[PDB]
Paper text:
One such protein is sulerythrin (SulE), a ruberythrin-like protein isolated from the thermophilic archeon Sulfolobus tokodaii. SulE lacks the characteristic C-terminal, rubredoxin-like FeS4 domain of ruberythrins and contains a binuclear metal centre that coordinates iron and zinc when isolated from S. tokodaii. In contrast to other members of the ruberythrin family, a crystal structure of native SulE shows that it forms homodimers through domain swapping, with each monomer contributing two α-helices to give two four-helix bundles that each harbour a solvent-accessible, single dimetal site. The exact function of SulE is unknown, but it is presumed to be involved in reactions against oxidative stress.
In order to test the effect of the total absorbed dose on SpReAD analysis, data collection at higher flux values was repeated on the same crystal used at 5% beamline flux, choosing distinct, non-overlapping positions at least 50 µm apart. Data sets at 13.5 keV and nine energies over the rising Fe K edge were collected at 10% and 100% flux. Using RADDOSE-3D, the total average diffraction-weighted dose was calculated to be 0.26 MGy for 5% flux, 0.52 MGy for 10% flux and 2.70 MGy for 100% flux. The SpReAD analysis was then repeated for the data collected at 10% and 100% beamline flux, refining the f′′ contribution for each of the two Fe-2 and Fe-4 positions observed at 100% flux separately. While there was no difference in the oxidation states of all iron ions between 5% and 10% flux, at 100% flux a clear difference was visible for Fe-2 and Fe-4 at position 2, where the edge position was coincident with Fe-1 and Fe-3, suggesting that iron ions at this position are reduced.
Author numbering:
A (entry chain B): 0 to 142
B (entry chain A): 0 to 143
Write the structure that this text describes.
Amino acid sequence: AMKDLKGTKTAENLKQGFIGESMANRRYLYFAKRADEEGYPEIAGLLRSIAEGETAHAFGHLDFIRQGGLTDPATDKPIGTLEQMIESAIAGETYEWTQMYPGFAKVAREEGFPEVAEWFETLARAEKSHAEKFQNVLKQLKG
Amino acid sequence: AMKDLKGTKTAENLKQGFIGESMANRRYLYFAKRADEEGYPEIAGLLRSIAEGETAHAFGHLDFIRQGGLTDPATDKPIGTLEQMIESAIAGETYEWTQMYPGFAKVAREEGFPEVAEWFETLARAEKSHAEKFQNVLKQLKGG
Ligand SMILES: [Cl-]
Ligand SMILES: [Cl-]
Ligand SMILES: [Fe+3]
Ligand SMILES: [Fe+3]
Ligand SMILES: [Fe+3]
Ligand SMILES: [Fe+3]
Ligand SMILES: [O-]
Ligand SMILES: [O-]
Protein backbone atom coordinates (compact mmCIF):
# COMPACT_ATOMS: atom_id res chain seq x y z
CA ALA A 1 0.00 0.00 0.00
CA MET A 2 0.93 3.69 0.00
CA LYS A 3 0.85 6.57 2.49
CA ASP A 4 -2.31 7.11 4.53
CA LEU A 5 -4.52 9.68 2.77
CA LYS A 6 -7.28 9.85 5.41
CA GLY A 7 -8.22 13.36 6.51
CA THR A 8 -6.48 15.20 3.66
CA LYS A 9 -7.83 17.51 0.99
CA THR A 10 -6.17 15.18 -1.53
CA ALA A 11 -8.55 12.43 -0.37
CA GLU A 12 -11.56 14.57 -1.29
CA ASN A 13 -9.94 15.65 -4.56
CA LEU A 14 -9.46 12.02 -5.59
CA LYS A 15 -13.15 11.44 -4.87
CA GLN A 16 -14.24 14.45 -6.92
CA GLY A 17 -11.84 13.48 -9.70
CA PHE A 18 -13.35 10.00 -9.80
CA ILE A 19 -16.87 11.45 -10.05
CA GLY A 20 -15.91 13.70 -12.95
CA GLU A 21 -14.03 11.01 -14.86
CA SER A 22 -16.93 8.57 -14.42
CA MET A 23 -19.40 11.10 -15.83
CA ALA A 24 -17.05 11.97 -18.69
CA ASN A 25 -16.82 8.41 -19.98
CA ARG A 26 -20.61 8.02 -19.93
CA ARG A 27 -21.12 11.42 -21.58
CA TYR A 28 -18.60 10.87 -24.38
CA LEU A 29 -19.96 7.42 -25.25
CA TYR A 30 -23.46 8.92 -25.35
CA PHE A 31 -22.24 11.76 -27.58
CA ALA A 32 -20.50 9.22 -29.81
CA LYS A 33 -23.84 7.54 -30.55
CA ARG A 34 -25.16 10.84 -31.90
CA ALA A 35 -22.07 11.09 -34.11
CA ASP A 36 -22.75 7.49 -35.18
CA GLU A 37 -26.31 8.29 -36.26
CA GLU A 38 -25.33 11.42 -38.18
CA GLY A 39 -22.50 9.72 -40.08
CA TYR A 40 -19.39 11.13 -38.38
CA PRO A 41 -17.44 7.90 -37.81
CA GLU A 42 -14.06 9.56 -37.27
CA ILE A 43 -15.55 11.93 -34.68
CA ALA A 44 -17.34 9.00 -33.03
CA GLY A 45 -14.14 6.97 -32.95
CA LEU A 46 -12.24 9.87 -31.39
CA LEU A 47 -14.93 10.31 -28.72
CA ARG A 48 -14.70 6.59 -27.94
CA SER A 49 -10.91 6.78 -27.65
CA ILE A 50 -11.08 9.83 -25.38
CA ALA A 51 -13.61 7.87 -23.32
CA GLU A 52 -10.97 5.15 -22.87
CA GLY A 53 -8.68 7.86 -21.52
CA GLU A 54 -11.31 8.83 -18.97
CA THR A 55 -11.62 5.16 -17.99
CA ALA A 56 -7.88 5.03 -17.31
CA HIS A 57 -8.18 8.21 -15.25
CA ALA A 58 -11.09 6.92 -13.17
CA PHE A 59 -9.34 3.59 -12.54
CA GLY A 60 -6.15 5.42 -11.54
CA HIS A 61 -8.08 7.54 -9.05
CA LEU A 62 -9.45 4.32 -7.56
CA ASP A 63 -5.92 2.89 -7.38
CA PHE A 64 -4.73 5.81 -5.24
CA ILE A 65 -7.93 5.77 -3.17
CA ARG A 66 -7.49 2.05 -2.47
CA GLN A 67 -3.73 2.19 -1.83
CA GLY A 68 -4.16 5.27 0.38
CA GLY A 69 -6.61 3.56 2.73
CA LEU A 70 -9.65 5.51 1.51
CA THR A 71 -13.18 4.29 0.85
CA ASP A 72 -15.34 3.89 -2.24
CA PRO A 73 -16.47 7.33 -3.50
CA ALA A 74 -19.99 6.01 -4.09
CA THR A 75 -20.62 4.17 -0.81
CA ASP A 76 -17.96 5.18 1.76
CA LYS A 77 -17.10 1.49 2.19
CA PRO A 78 -13.63 -0.09 1.92
CA ILE A 79 -12.73 -1.68 -1.40
CA GLY A 80 -9.40 -3.33 -0.63
CA THR A 81 -10.34 -6.97 -1.17
CA LEU A 82 -12.72 -8.57 -3.64
CA GLU A 83 -15.16 -9.40 -0.84
CA GLN A 84 -15.10 -5.75 0.24
CA MET A 85 -15.68 -4.68 -3.37
CA ILE A 86 -18.78 -6.88 -3.58
CA GLU A 87 -19.95 -5.57 -0.20
CA SER A 88 -19.62 -2.04 -1.58
CA ALA A 89 -21.69 -2.98 -4.62
CA ILE A 90 -24.37 -4.47 -2.35
CA ALA A 91 -24.48 -1.34 -0.19
CA GLY A 92 -24.85 0.98 -3.17
CA GLU A 93 -27.52 -1.08 -4.92
CA THR A 94 -29.40 -1.41 -1.62
CA TYR A 95 -29.41 2.37 -1.14
CA GLU A 96 -30.67 2.79 -4.71
CA TRP A 97 -33.64 0.40 -4.46
CA THR A 98 -34.67 1.00 -0.84
CA GLN A 99 -34.33 4.80 -0.82
CA MET A 100 -33.13 6.69 -3.88
CA TYR A 101 -35.19 5.51 -6.85
CA PRO A 102 -38.46 5.00 -4.91
CA GLY A 103 -38.10 8.57 -3.66
CA PHE A 104 -37.31 9.85 -7.15
CA ALA A 105 -40.41 8.08 -8.45
CA LYS A 106 -42.66 9.52 -5.74
CA VAL A 107 -41.42 13.06 -6.46
CA ALA A 108 -41.81 12.61 -10.23
CA ARG A 109 -45.45 11.60 -9.76
CA GLU A 110 -46.07 14.51 -7.40
CA GLU A 111 -44.60 16.91 -9.98
CA GLY A 112 -46.76 15.48 -12.77
CA PHE A 113 -44.14 13.47 -14.67
CA PRO A 114 -45.57 9.93 -14.65
CA GLU A 115 -43.40 8.65 -17.52
CA VAL A 116 -40.25 9.68 -15.65
CA ALA A 117 -41.73 8.07 -12.53
CA GLU A 118 -42.25 4.80 -14.42
CA TRP A 119 -38.58 4.93 -15.45
CA PHE A 120 -37.45 5.45 -11.86
CA GLU A 121 -39.70 2.57 -10.76
CA THR A 122 -38.21 0.29 -13.42
CA LEU A 123 -34.75 1.22 -12.14
CA ALA A 124 -35.74 0.60 -8.51
CA ARG A 125 -36.71 -2.97 -9.41
CA ALA A 126 -33.51 -3.35 -11.44
CA GLU A 127 -31.27 -2.25 -8.57
CA LYS A 128 -33.00 -4.69 -6.21
CA SER A 129 -32.24 -7.44 -8.73
CA HIS A 130 -28.61 -6.28 -8.88
CA ALA A 131 -28.36 -6.28 -5.08
CA GLU A 132 -29.74 -9.82 -4.84
CA LYS A 133 -27.28 -11.10 -7.44
CA PHE A 134 -24.33 -9.44 -5.70
CA GLN A 135 -25.48 -10.94 -2.39
CA ASN A 136 -25.41 -14.36 -4.06
CA VAL A 137 -21.81 -13.63 -5.12
CA LEU A 138 -20.79 -12.72 -1.57
CA LYS A 139 -22.29 -15.84 0.02
CA GLN A 140 -20.41 -17.93 -2.54
CA LEU A 141 -17.12 -16.09 -1.94
CA LYS A 142 -17.50 -16.54 1.83
CA GLY A 143 -18.29 -20.26 1.54
CA ALA B 1 -44.79 19.18 -19.17
CA MET B 2 -42.19 16.42 -19.45
CA LYS B 3 -40.56 18.49 -22.21
CA ASP B 4 -39.90 21.32 -19.73
CA LEU B 5 -38.35 19.98 -16.52
CA LYS B 6 -36.35 23.09 -15.60
CA GLY B 7 -36.50 24.10 -11.96
CA THR B 8 -38.15 20.91 -10.71
CA LYS B 9 -36.87 18.43 -8.16
CA THR B 10 -37.15 15.72 -10.82
CA ALA B 11 -34.53 17.65 -12.81
CA GLU B 12 -32.10 17.43 -9.89
CA ASN B 13 -32.94 13.76 -9.34
CA LEU B 14 -32.12 12.93 -12.97
CA LYS B 15 -28.75 14.66 -12.52
CA GLN B 16 -27.96 12.79 -9.30
CA GLY B 17 -29.15 9.53 -10.82
CA PHE B 18 -26.80 10.04 -13.75
CA ILE B 19 -23.85 10.69 -11.42
CA GLY B 20 -24.52 7.53 -9.41
CA GLU B 21 -25.03 5.35 -12.47
CA SER B 22 -21.82 6.69 -14.03
CA MET B 23 -19.81 5.83 -10.92
CA ALA B 24 -21.44 2.40 -10.69
CA ASN B 25 -20.31 1.35 -14.17
CA ARG B 26 -16.73 2.46 -13.48
CA ARG B 27 -16.70 0.75 -10.07
CA TYR B 28 -18.03 -2.58 -11.32
CA LEU B 29 -15.59 -2.77 -14.25
CA TYR B 30 -12.77 -1.97 -11.81
CA PHE B 31 -13.98 -4.67 -9.41
CA ALA B 32 -14.22 -7.14 -12.30
CA LYS B 33 -10.46 -6.83 -12.85
CA ARG B 34 -9.84 -8.15 -9.34
CA ALA B 35 -12.16 -11.08 -10.00
CA ASP B 36 -10.26 -11.63 -13.26
CA GLU B 37 -6.89 -11.82 -11.50
CA GLU B 38 -8.12 -14.17 -8.77
CA GLY B 39 -9.83 -16.61 -11.15
CA TYR B 40 -13.52 -15.80 -10.59
CA PRO B 41 -14.77 -15.56 -14.19
CA GLU B 42 -18.45 -15.95 -13.28
CA ILE B 43 -18.21 -13.11 -10.75
CA ALA B 44 -16.30 -10.99 -13.26
CA GLY B 45 -18.88 -11.72 -15.95
CA LEU B 46 -21.73 -10.78 -13.63
CA LEU B 47 -20.01 -7.51 -12.68
CA ARG B 48 -19.54 -6.73 -16.38
CA SER B 49 -23.15 -7.57 -17.27
CA ILE B 50 -24.57 -5.51 -14.40
CA ALA B 51 -22.25 -2.71 -15.53
CA GLU B 52 -24.07 -2.77 -18.88
CA GLY B 53 -27.29 -2.27 -16.94
CA GLU B 54 -25.83 0.81 -15.28
CA THR B 55 -24.81 2.11 -18.72
CA ALA B 56 -28.41 1.76 -19.90
CA HIS B 57 -29.59 3.59 -16.77
CA ALA B 58 -27.13 6.46 -17.22
CA PHE B 59 -28.00 6.83 -20.91
CA GLY B 60 -31.72 6.79 -20.08
CA HIS B 61 -31.21 9.57 -17.55
CA LEU B 62 -29.49 11.61 -20.27
CA ASP B 63 -32.41 10.90 -22.61
CA PHE B 64 -34.88 12.46 -20.16
CA ILE B 65 -32.47 15.31 -19.37
CA ARG B 66 -32.17 16.25 -23.04
CA GLN B 67 -35.87 15.71 -23.78
CA GLY B 68 -36.75 17.93 -20.82
CA GLY B 69 -34.61 20.85 -21.91
CA LEU B 70 -32.11 20.27 -19.10
CA THR B 71 -28.34 20.69 -19.20
CA ASP B 72 -25.33 18.40 -19.04
CA PRO B 73 -24.84 17.19 -15.44
CA ALA B 74 -21.09 17.82 -15.73
CA THR B 75 -21.04 21.31 -17.25
CA ASP B 76 -24.53 22.89 -16.98
CA LYS B 77 -24.41 23.34 -20.78
CA PRO B 78 -27.10 22.25 -23.26
CA ILE B 79 -26.47 18.94 -25.01
CA GLY B 80 -29.33 18.75 -27.50
CA THR B 81 -27.37 18.80 -30.76
CA LEU B 82 -24.04 17.21 -31.61
CA GLU B 83 -22.37 20.63 -31.78
CA GLN B 84 -23.74 21.43 -28.32
CA MET B 85 -22.44 18.10 -27.03
CA ILE B 86 -18.95 18.91 -28.33
CA GLU B 87 -19.15 22.43 -26.88
CA SER B 88 -19.99 20.89 -23.51
CA ALA B 89 -16.97 18.58 -23.78
CA ILE B 90 -14.71 21.53 -24.62
CA ALA B 91 -15.94 23.51 -21.62
CA GLY B 92 -15.51 20.60 -19.20
CA GLU B 93 -12.05 19.59 -20.39
CA THR B 94 -10.95 23.23 -20.34
CA TYR B 95 -12.03 23.56 -16.70
CA GLU B 96 -10.18 20.34 -15.86
CA TRP B 97 -6.81 21.33 -17.36
CA THR B 98 -6.80 25.06 -16.56
CA GLN B 99 -8.14 24.86 -12.99
CA MET B 100 -9.17 21.55 -11.47
CA TYR B 101 -6.23 19.19 -11.93
CA PRO B 102 -3.51 21.87 -11.50
CA GLY B 103 -5.17 22.83 -8.22
CA PHE B 104 -5.43 19.19 -7.15
CA ALA B 105 -1.74 18.71 -7.98
CA LYS B 106 -0.66 21.75 -5.96
CA VAL B 107 -2.62 20.52 -2.93
CA ALA B 108 -1.19 17.01 -3.26
CA ARG B 109 2.37 18.36 -3.36
CA GLU B 110 1.79 20.64 -0.37
CA GLU B 111 0.25 17.75 1.61
CA GLY B 112 3.29 15.54 0.95
CA PHE B 113 1.87 13.16 -1.70
CA PRO B 114 4.19 13.66 -4.68
CA GLU B 115 3.10 10.49 -6.50
CA VAL B 116 -0.52 11.64 -6.43
CA ALA B 117 0.58 15.13 -7.50
CA GLU B 118 2.47 13.70 -10.48
CA TRP B 119 -0.68 11.77 -11.42
CA PHE B 120 -2.78 14.94 -11.26
CA GLU B 121 -0.18 16.74 -13.39
CA THR B 122 -0.27 13.95 -15.98
CA LEU B 123 -4.06 14.24 -16.05
CA ALA B 124 -3.92 18.03 -16.40
CA ARG B 125 -1.82 17.63 -19.55
CA ALA B 126 -4.12 14.85 -20.75
CA GLU B 127 -7.24 16.99 -20.36
CA LYS B 128 -5.53 19.81 -22.28
CA SER B 129 -4.97 17.34 -25.11
CA HIS B 130 -8.59 16.17 -24.87
CA ALA B 131 -9.82 19.77 -25.00
CA GLU B 132 -7.74 20.42 -28.12
CA LYS B 133 -9.11 17.27 -29.78
CA PHE B 134 -12.70 18.31 -29.05
CA GLN B 135 -11.88 21.79 -30.34
CA ASN B 136 -10.74 20.15 -33.59
CA VAL B 137 -14.01 18.21 -33.74
CA LEU B 138 -15.95 21.46 -33.47
CA LYS B 139 -13.86 23.05 -36.24
CA GLN B 140 -14.69 20.06 -38.44
CA LEU B 141 -18.41 20.27 -37.68
CA LYS B 142 -18.37 23.99 -38.53
CA GLY B 143 -16.62 23.37 -41.87
CA GLY B 144 -12.97 22.84 -40.99
CL1 LIG C 1 -16.25 11.93 -39.20
CL1 LIG D 1 -16.40 -17.38 -10.48
FE1 LIG E 1 -9.87 12.53 -17.55
FE1 LIG F 1 -27.07 0.28 -9.38
FE1 LIG G 1 -28.49 1.50 -12.15
FE1 LIG H 1 -11.66 14.92 -19.10
O1 LIG I 1 -11.43 13.91 -17.51
O1 LIG J 1 -27.43 1.89 -10.38
